[PDB]
Structure 1
Amino acid sequence: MGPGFDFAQAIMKKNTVIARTEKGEFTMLGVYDRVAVIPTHASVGEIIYINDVETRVLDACALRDLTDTNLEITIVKLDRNQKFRDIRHFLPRCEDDYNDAVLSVHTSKFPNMYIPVGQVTNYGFLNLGGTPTHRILMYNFPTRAGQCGGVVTTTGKVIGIHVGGNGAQGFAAMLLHSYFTD
């Protein structure tokens, strides 16, 4: 509808795949080469389905900060025959608050979904399904099951991936440029 949805559409059309694990279907952001992200609660194994293609997982790393606290972000390298468009120049370098964010999801269940979630708070600490988690973004939209892995953008920046909610609020793990230096 506006420049917010335009930026979000540009990311979804070129930089997402449908990831399937034994824990279900997830929106999965491709960042560069064969490197993508997914919520840690997807429990990525040795094999994953990517757009329904059986894919060997070359590497998978569950990120924690230097306080040894969960970040809820898994970085996956896929044995895929095609590279992603490099979108690392769209990642923020520092933790921050934002205005006018969109949350975008693409699964079997929720194809081409875009939600204007509005203002995003640098929330910080969250007890997420009982796990102490850091670097959480918070937005006041009643997000639901099927949206985890959903991409959070502002015009010009990819800022996080949806990892849960409490029925009033939704929660995203921050993406930072320093996660994807090669």
Structure 2
Amino acid sequence: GPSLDFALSLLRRNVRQVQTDQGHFTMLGVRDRLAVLPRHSQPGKTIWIEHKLVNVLDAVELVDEQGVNLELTLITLDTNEKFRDITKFIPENISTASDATLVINTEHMPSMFVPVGDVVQYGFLNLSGKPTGRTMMYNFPTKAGQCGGVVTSVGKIIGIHIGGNGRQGFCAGLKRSYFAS
């Protein structure tokens, strides 16, 4: 329902195709020159965005208050573009959902939407040997190439896709405070 239309608007204004040396990812533009990627994309000093090479001014790998990996990297892009500020749609606390849509946009998987259904609290995740906190899980067979995908519910941006085991998928939860100045 209304979830899907919200997801479509977010795609056009805030979701971009990127490529690093690690491959193709979806990127969420958060506000102005600030964006977020899965940590394992390992963005360097230059990144491909929508067929242009773009300088990266700064990058920070996010951890929680105890130091646990959140599997998210915040980057500031050297770009003319200024993302519409979508932080008001990110909840203050990690939020589950009943009818979520995953928004993917890479060169190999352009502009696609996947109804993943319920997104439930999971927490600690061992992701190919890398400990990760604050994850959520969906019972949907997500696949390689979908990392960075944005998990949304009606009027809420709740996660970034980071992994899966063939039958289930997992996202890093989003909190508004990650993006505070």
Give the structure-1-normalised TM-score: 0.97
Give deviations 1:59-116, integer Å, cap 9, x for gaps. Answer: 0000011221110000000001110001010001012322100001011211121111
Distance in 1 between residues matched to 2:102 and 2:96, nearest whole Å: 15
Amino acid at match of 1:133: T
Query: Which ranges of 4 or more aligned residues in structure 1 deviate by more than 2 Å?
Result: none
Of 152-161 and 109-118, more deviation after overlay is shown by: 109-118
**Number of residue-to-residue matches in the alignment:** 181
Amino acid at match of 1:177: R
Instruction: Tell me the equivalent position of 1:176.
Output: 175
Distance in 2 between residues matched to 1:50 and 1:35, nearest whole Å: 14
Instruction: Tell me the equivalent position of 1:21.
Output: 20
Give % identity.
Answer: 53
Q: Does residue 60 of structure 2 align to residue 80 of structure 1?
A: no
Instruction: Tell me the equivalent position of 1:103.
Output: 102
Distance in 1 between residues matched to 2:174 and 2:82, nearest whole Å: 20
1:15-94 matches, within 5 Å, as: 15-94=14-93
Aligned-partner SS, 2:26: strand
Structure 2 unmatched runs, 5+: none
Distance in 1 between residues matched to 2:85 and 2:15, nearest whole Å: 12
Give the structure-2-normalised TM-score: 0.98
Structure 1 unmatched runs, 5+: none
Distance in 1 between residues matched to 2:65 and 2:7, nearest whole Å: 31
Q: Does residue 5 of structure 2 align to residue 6 of structure 1?
A: yes
Aligned-partner SS, 1:120: strand
Instruction: Tell me the equivalent position of 1:149.
Output: 148
Distance in 2 between residues matched to 1:94 and 1:167, nearest whole Å: 28
Amino acid at match of 2:133: H
